[PDB]
């Protein structure tokens, strides 16, 4: 089955904060409300050490 | 060092189709526009066998 859950990061934050939070929490991807664009984004760890940021833009 | 890309799945789809797409494409998580709620959701595979669906809010 598909287990439904609500986004953990409730409050809006910056892309910079999102990346740090993902790292401190030990995750590989992190869903958040971008406070600078008022849109939901997803940051993730790329297999090249870099970070990726997915936006609806 | 932060590479900005646009969501790959442009058109809205069901959560089931999203899980299928995630697997067919070989990813661990998949961002999509849920056609049921018209909102962006994220499906992912969890070490438990099941799949997870992240929503901004509960309907």
Automatic annotation (TrEMBL), chain B:
It comes from the Bacteria. Coiled coil: none annotated. Residues 1-53 form the Sigma 54 modulation/S30EA ribosomal protein C-terminal domain. Required for dimerization of active 70S ribosomes into 100S ribosomes in stationary phase; 100S ribosomes are translationally inactive and sometimes present during exponential growth. Interacts with 100S ribosomes. Belongs to the HPF/YfiA ribosome-associated protein family. Long HPF subfamily. This is Ribosome hibernation promoting factor. The lineage of its organism: Bacteria, Bacillati, Bacillota, Clostridia, Eubacteriales.
